[PDB]
Design an enzyme around this catalytic site. Structure first.
Site, PDB file in Angstrom:
ATOM      1  N   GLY A   1       0.813  -1.206   0.000  1.00  0.00           N
ATOM      2  CA  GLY A   1       0.000   0.000   0.000  1.00  0.00           C
ATOM      3  C   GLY A   1       0.845   1.254   0.000  1.00  0.00           C
ATOM      4  O   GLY A   1       2.076   1.191   0.004  1.00  0.00           O
TER       5      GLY A   1
ATOM      6  N   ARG B   1     -13.349   1.479   5.579  1.00  0.00           N
ATOM      7  CA  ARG B   1     -11.994   1.605   5.016  1.00  0.00           C
ATOM      8  C   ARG B   1     -10.890   1.701   6.070  1.00  0.00           C
ATOM      9  O   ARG B   1      -9.708   1.491   5.760  1.00  0.00           O
ATOM     10  CB  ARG B   1     -11.879   2.816   4.089  1.00  0.00           C
ATOM     11  CG  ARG B   1     -12.046   4.176   4.754  1.00  0.00           C
ATOM     12  CD  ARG B   1     -12.028   5.293   3.714  1.00  0.00           C
ATOM     13  NE  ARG B   1     -12.571   6.558   4.230  1.00  0.00           N
ATOM     14  CZ  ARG B   1     -13.006   7.568   3.468  1.00  0.00           C
ATOM     15  NH1 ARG B   1     -12.991   7.483   2.140  1.00  0.00           N
ATOM     16  NH2 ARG B   1     -13.469   8.672   4.046  1.00  0.00           N
ATOM     17  N   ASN B   2     -11.283   2.031   7.298  1.00  0.00           N
ATOM     18  CA  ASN B   2     -10.358   2.143   8.424  1.00  0.00           C
ATOM     19  C   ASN B   2     -10.434   0.958   9.387  1.00  0.00           C
ATOM     20  O   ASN B   2      -9.921   1.019  10.505  1.00  0.00           O
ATOM     21  CB  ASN B   2     -10.622   3.461   9.151  1.00  0.00           C
ATOM     22  CG  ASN B   2     -10.289   4.675   8.281  1.00  0.00           C
ATOM     23  OD1 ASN B   2      -9.424   4.595   7.397  1.00  0.00           O
ATOM     24  ND2 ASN B   2     -10.980   5.786   8.511  1.00  0.00           N
TER      25      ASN B   2
ATOM     26  N   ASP C   1      -6.313   3.256  11.812  1.00  0.00           N
ATOM     27  CA  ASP C   1      -6.406   4.659  11.429  1.00  0.00           C
ATOM     28  C   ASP C   1      -6.590   5.553  12.651  1.00  0.00           C
ATOM     29  O   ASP C   1      -7.674   6.089  12.882  1.00  0.00           O
ATOM     30  CB  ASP C   1      -7.557   4.871  10.445  1.00  0.00           C
ATOM     31  CG  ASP C   1      -7.653   6.305   9.959  1.00  0.00           C
ATOM     32  OD1 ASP C   1      -6.609   6.877   9.584  1.00  0.00           O
ATOM     33  OD2 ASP C   1      -8.773   6.857   9.953  1.00  0.00           O
TER      34      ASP C   1
ATOM     35  N   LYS D   1       5.270   0.381   8.014  1.00  0.00           N
ATOM     36  CA  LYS D   1       5.089   1.675   7.383  1.00  0.00           C
ATOM     37  C   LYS D   1       6.362   2.467   7.563  1.00  0.00           C
ATOM     38  O   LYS D   1       6.893   2.529   8.667  1.00  0.00           O
ATOM     39  CB  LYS D   1       3.917   2.415   8.003  1.00  0.00           C
ATOM     40  CG  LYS D   1       2.589   1.735   7.709  1.00  0.00           C
ATOM     41  CD  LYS D   1       1.438   2.713   7.669  1.00  0.00           C
ATOM     42  CE  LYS D   1       1.228   3.432   8.986  1.00  0.00           C
ATOM     43  NZ  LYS D   1      -0.077   4.175   9.002  1.00  0.00           N
TER      44      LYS D   1
ATOM     45  N   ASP E   1     -13.114   8.945  12.779  1.00  0.00           N
ATOM     46  CA  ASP E   1     -12.965   8.485  11.395  1.00  0.00           C
ATOM     47  C   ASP E   1     -13.439   7.043  11.182  1.00  0.00           C
ATOM     48  O   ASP E   1     -13.044   6.393  10.212  1.00  0.00           O
ATOM     49  CB  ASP E   1     -11.528   8.765  10.925  1.00  0.00           C
ATOM     50  CG  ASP E   1     -11.377   8.847   9.391  1.00  0.00           C
ATOM     51  OD1 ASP E   1     -12.373   8.954   8.634  1.00  0.00           O
ATOM     52  OD2 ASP E   1     -10.208   8.816   8.943  1.00  0.00           O
TER      53      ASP E   1
HETATM   54  N1  LIG Z   1      -1.587  -4.098   9.318  1.00  0.00           N
HETATM   55  C1  LIG Z   1      -1.759  -4.257   7.984  1.00  0.00           C
HETATM   56  N2  LIG Z   1      -1.763  -5.475   7.390  1.00  0.00           N
HETATM   57  C2  LIG Z   1      -1.923  -5.643   6.065  1.00  0.00           C
HETATM   58  N3  LIG Z   1      -2.105  -4.606   5.220  1.00  0.00           N
HETATM   59  C3  LIG Z   1      -2.114  -3.342   5.689  1.00  0.00           C
HETATM   60  C4  LIG Z   1      -1.930  -3.082   7.123  1.00  0.00           C
HETATM   61  N4  LIG Z   1      -1.978  -1.755   7.309  1.00  0.00           N
HETATM   62  C5  LIG Z   1      -2.175  -1.204   6.077  1.00  0.00           C
HETATM   63  N5  LIG Z   1      -2.251  -2.152   5.119  1.00  0.00           N
HETATM   64  C6  LIG Z   1      -2.468  -1.999   3.651  1.00  0.00           C
HETATM   65  O1  LIG Z   1      -2.021  -0.724   3.205  1.00  0.00           O
HETATM   66  C7  LIG Z   1      -3.116   0.012   2.646  1.00  0.00           C
HETATM   67  C8  LIG Z   1      -2.976   1.472   3.023  1.00  0.00           C
HETATM   68  O2  LIG Z   1      -2.771   1.565   4.431  1.00  0.00           O
HETATM   69  P1  LIG Z   1      -3.677   2.514   5.366  1.00  0.00           P
HETATM   70  O3  LIG Z   1      -3.472   2.097   6.802  1.00  0.00           O
HETATM   71  O4  LIG Z   1      -5.076   2.504   4.808  1.00  0.00           O
HETATM   72  O5  LIG Z   1      -2.968   3.947   5.160  1.00  0.00           O
HETATM   73  P2  LIG Z   1      -3.697   5.264   4.582  1.00  0.00           P
HETATM   74  O6  LIG Z   1      -2.741   6.386   4.891  1.00  0.00           O
HETATM   75  O7  LIG Z   1      -5.084   5.360   5.181  1.00  0.00           O
HETATM   76  N6  LIG Z   1      -3.800   5.163   2.843  1.00  0.00           N
HETATM   77  P3  LIG Z   1      -5.274   4.735   2.001  1.00  0.00           P
HETATM   78  O8  LIG Z   1      -6.096   3.915   2.969  1.00  0.00           O
HETATM   79  O9  LIG Z   1      -4.826   3.963   0.792  1.00  0.00           O
HETATM   80  O10 LIG Z   1      -5.899   6.061   1.629  1.00  0.00           O
HETATM   81  C9  LIG Z   1      -4.377  -0.637   3.206  1.00  0.00           C
HETATM   82  O11 LIG Z   1      -5.520  -0.479   2.358  1.00  0.00           O
HETATM   83  C10 LIG Z   1      -3.960  -2.077   3.350  1.00  0.00           C
HETATM   84  O12 LIG Z   1      -4.193  -2.787   2.127  1.00  0.00           O
HETATM   85 MG   LIG Z   2      -6.668   4.057   5.322  1.00  0.00          MG
END
Ligand SMILES: Nc1ncnc2c1ncn2[C@@H]1O[C@H](COP(=O)(O)OP(=O)(O)NP(=O)(O)O)[C@@H](O)[C@H]1O
Ligand SMILES: [Mg+2]
Length: 285
Positions: free
Chosen positions: A32, A154-155, A168, A57, A150
Site C-alpha cells: 500500500g 476503510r479504516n 487509522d 510503514k 474516522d
Molecule cells: N496491518 C496491515 N496489514 C496488512 N495490510 C495493511 C496493514 N496496514 C495497512 N495495510 C495496507 O495498506 C493500505 C494502506 O494503508 P492505510 O493504513 O489505509 O494507510 P492510509 O494512509 O489510510 N492510505 P489509504 O487507505 O490507501 O488512503 C491498506 O488499504 C492495506 O491494504
Molecule cells: Mg486508510
C-alpha cells in the site's frame, strides 16, 4: 484512560511504543501507500525468537519535522491500546532511518475493499461476527476516553480468520459523521456510535459507499431532515433497527458501545433471529 499526545522533548511515542532493533525486521513486498510513505508486509523476530508477520510503514526520505510528528503521533495513540479488535503496535524504529511503524499483519486488508470482492458471499453470522469485533474494539476505545472521529469500513482491517480490527488513529468524513459533529464539531463517543451505524450499513451492503455519490450538501441536509440510508438487500430486521438506533437524531438516545456488543452477542446466540428480514428513507420521529 487514553492520554492525548499533546510538549515532550521529542518522543511521546517511546512512552507507548517499543523501540525495535531493525535487524529483527525483514521486508517482503509493498502492499500500500500512505500519507507519509510506503506500506509493506514483512516479518518480525520477537525477543523470544518467535517470528511473526507484520505490516511495516516507512517515513519517506526528506520528511518534514511536522510529517515525522504526525507519523509517529499515530503510533503514540495506537500503542495505548491493547485489545484483540484494535490493531496491535509491535513497535517503532526511530534510531535509524527510514523511521518505521510496525503493526500486526492483516492478510485480507481494508474491510470495505475486501467485502466488495465478495458481494453476497458470506453468511449473515459471518458478517455479524465481523461487526461484533468492530463494536468490541470501539467499546474499549470509548472506555479509554478516545473518540476516533474516522470510524469507517476503510479504516477497519481484516485478518486471515476474518477478525476485524479498528485502525487509522490519525475535517471531515461527512458521510460517516454525526449531524451534531457536522453542525458544530460536537464529537463524543455517541458520534462514534453514529459512525458505527454507517459501518454496519457498509458491511451489510458489502462495501457500497454510504450515500453513494450524493452531493455533500445533500447528505448533510437529507440526514438533518430525518432521511436515512435504506435497508441493504436481504438485511435482517434486527440489524436495520440497530442502524436506525445508531442514527438517532438525539445523541443521548443512541446505544452505548457496550449495548451494541450485547445486541450482537444475542443475535450470535440466537441466529434464528436473523431470519426476520426487513433512495433514502424518511424516519423522522
Ligand atoms: N496491518 C496491515 N496489514 C496488512 N495490510 C495493511 C496493514 N496496514 C495497512 N495495510 C495496507 O495498506 C493500505 C494502506 O494503508 P492505510 O493504513 O489505509 O494507510 P492510509 O494512509 O489510510 N492510505 P489509504 O487507505 O490507501 O488512503 C491498506 O488499504 C492495506 O491494504
Ligand atoms: Mg486508510
Amino acid at each position: 484512560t487514553y492520554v492525548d499526545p499533546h510538549e515532550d522533548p521529542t518522543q511521546t511515542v517511546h512512552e507507548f511504543a517499543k523501540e525495535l532493533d531493525a535487524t529483527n525486521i525483514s521486508i517482503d513486498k509493498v502492499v500500500g501507500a500512505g500519507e507519509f510513505g510506503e506500506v509493506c508486509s514483512g516479518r518480525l523476530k520477537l525477543p523470544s525468537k518467535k517470528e511473526i508477520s507484520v505490516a511495516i510503514k516507512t517515513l519517506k526520505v526528506g520528511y518534514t519535522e511536522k510529517q515525522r510528528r504526525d507519523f509517529l503521533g499515530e503510533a503514540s495513540i495506537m500503542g495505548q491500546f491493547d485489545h484483540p479488535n484494535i490493531i496491535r503496535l509491535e513497535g517503532v524504529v526511530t534510531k535509524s532511518k527510514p523511521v518505521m511503524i510496525v503493526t500486526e499483519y492483516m492478510e485480507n486488508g481494508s474491510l470495505d475493499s475486501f467485502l466488495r470482492k465478495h458481494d453476497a458471499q458470506f453468511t449473515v453470522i459471518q458478517l455479524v461476527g465481523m461487526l461484533r469485533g468492530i463494536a468490541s474494539g470501539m467499546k474499549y476505545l470509548s472506555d479509554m476516553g478516545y473518540v476516533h472521529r474516522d470510524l469507517a469500513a476503510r479504516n477497519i482491517l481484516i485478518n486471515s480468520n476474518l477478525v476485524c480490527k479498528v485502525s487509522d488513529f490519525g475535517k471531515i468524513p461527512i458521510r460517516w459523521t454525526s449531524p451534531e459533529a457536522i453542525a458544530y464539531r460536537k464529537f463524543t463517543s455517541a458520534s462514534d456510535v453514529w459512525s458505527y451505524g454507517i459501518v454496519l450499513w457498509e458491511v451489510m451492503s458489502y462495501g457500497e459507499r454510504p450515500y453513494w455519490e450524493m452531493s455533500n450538501q445533500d447528505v448533510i441536509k437529507a440526514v438533518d431532515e430525518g432521511y436515512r440510508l435504506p435497508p441493504p438487500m436481504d438485511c435482517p430486521a434486527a440489524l436495520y433497527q440497530l442502524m436506525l438506533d445508531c442514527w438517532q437524531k438525539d445523541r443521548n438516545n443512541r446505544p452505548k458501545f457496550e449495548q451494541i456488543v450485547s445486541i450482537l452477542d444475542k443475535l450470535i446466540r440466537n441466529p434464528g433471529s436473523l431470519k426476520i428480514i426487513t433512495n433514502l428513507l424518511l424516519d423522522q420521529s
